[PDB]
Design a protein around this ligand. Structure first.
Ligand SMILES: NC(=O)c1ccc[n+]([C@@H]2O[C@H](COP(=O)([O-])OP(=O)(O)OC[C@H]3O[C@@H](n4cnc5c(N)ncnc54)[C@H](OP(=O)(O)O)[C@@H]3O)[C@@H](O)[C@H]2O)c1
Ligand SMILES: O=C1NC(=O)[C@@]2(CCOc3ccc(F)cc32)N1
Length: 315
């Protein structure tokens, strides 16, 4: 299937286009191209500083009647400096204005860690530690719930929440809407079997980010694993007459995950969508799972002292 059913009753396209690091001067064409070749899910965030340009593309394709708004699934995320109750609606509204939408299909808390509000996305003390917010994530969740009740967003969810933190929301006193999605890093070097099994057992759909291992990540290092260059993965791809990237995208699809590979290259945007016409065997799947080494692209290194840092816990 091309879409998965969420616990809000809506369907989510299992393949979406990522936009983190997509330059503002290229992301408009990238999203136009994506919609032209079949993508119907775009993953956004205010912290990416490119939602206006994403929005130009979405609006042009609606205006051109290439797609209807109901056929699109647009996702964005509440940044850490907006966890205060009183700031959540404005953050959402800024994102909607930038995207030129009147609702989001899904709005996620981007990280469980709240930071001091202000202009800086990572407010620092004079020794370099990130300055936290005293707002807890249960109160931020209630504010996200209000957005559903005001019609600004059709679904709410979370991102980079560990198992105990997911459980904290599920056990929130007076919980009104369960999270629909937990968006987490997931690829053959970070397979996340425990967290995924937990979320799925609870009816929470998992979205896999950095499925290609984010080769364009700013902190990349030479001695770093490279999925795209792993000859074991190239071999599985060759066996199937597909590219390595296509195998890396198909892999989470077959674990009943949603996946959001990023590209600004038209050829690769198209290539990455051509993943509905082949199947990995169970053996292929177990083989890819065996490459796990708990290697993270996105460790939020600067925030390891925050109380709500999600990656001390095993999963
Ligand atoms: N929730 C969060 O905290 C969080 C964190 C990280 C990421 N995300 C989301 O997940 C998305 C994807 O993750 P990501 O951006 O970290 O990395 P990714 O999708 O794993 O990899 C993107 C990189 O792979 C390249 N690439 C794409 N298709 C390729 C192909 N077919 N062949 C060879 N290279 C290819 C891209 O190049 P070009 O663009 O130059 O083509 C880019 O350098 C993000 O953009 C964002 O939307 C969310
Ligand atoms: O897609 C992403 N979501 C994120 O939180 C991340 C990873 C780690 O932190 C940052 C910081 C700035 C940013 F634009 C992005 C990011 N990338």
């Amino acid at each position: 299937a091309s879409r998965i059913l969420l616990n809000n009753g809506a369907k989510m396209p299992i393949l979406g286009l990522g936009t983190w690091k997509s330059p503002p001067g290229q992301v408009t064409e990238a999203v136009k191209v994506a919609i032209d070749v079949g993508y119907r899910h775009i993953d956004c965030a205010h912290v990416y500083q490119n939602e206006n340009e994403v929005g130009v593309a979405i609006q042009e394709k609606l205006r051109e009647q290439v797609v209807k708004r109901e056929e699109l699934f647009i996702v964005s995320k509440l940044w850490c400096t907006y966890h205060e109750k009183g700031l959540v609606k404005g953050a959402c509204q800024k994102t909607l204005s930038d995207l030129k939408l009147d609702y989001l299909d899904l709005y996620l808390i981007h990280w469980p860690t709240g930071f001091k509000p202000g202009k800086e996305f990572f407010p620092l003390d004079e020794s370099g530690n990130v300055v936290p917010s005293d707002t807890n994530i249960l109160d931020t969740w209630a504010a996200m719930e209000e957005l559903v009740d005001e019609g600004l967003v059709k679904a709410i969810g979370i991102s980079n929440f560990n198992h105990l933190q997911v459980e904290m929301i599920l056990n929130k006193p007076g919980l009104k809407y369960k999270p629909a999605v937990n968006q987490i890093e997931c690829h053959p070097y970070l397979t996340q079997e425990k967290l995924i099994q937990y979320c799925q057992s609870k009816g929470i759909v998992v979205t896999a980010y950095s499925p290609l291992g984010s080769p364009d990540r700013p902190w990349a290092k030479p001695e770093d694993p490279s999925l795209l260059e792993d000859p074991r993965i190239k071999a599985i791809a060759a066996k199937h007459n597909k590219t390595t990237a296509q195998v890396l995208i198909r892999f989470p699809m077959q674990r009943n995950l949603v996946v959001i590979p990023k590209s600004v290259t038209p050829e690769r945007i198209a290539e990455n969508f051509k993943v509905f016409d082949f199947e990995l065997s169970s053996q292929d799947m177990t083989t890819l799972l065996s490459y796990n080494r708990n290697w993270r692209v996105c460790a939020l290194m600067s925030c390891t002292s925050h109380k709500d840092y999600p990656f001390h816990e095993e999963f």
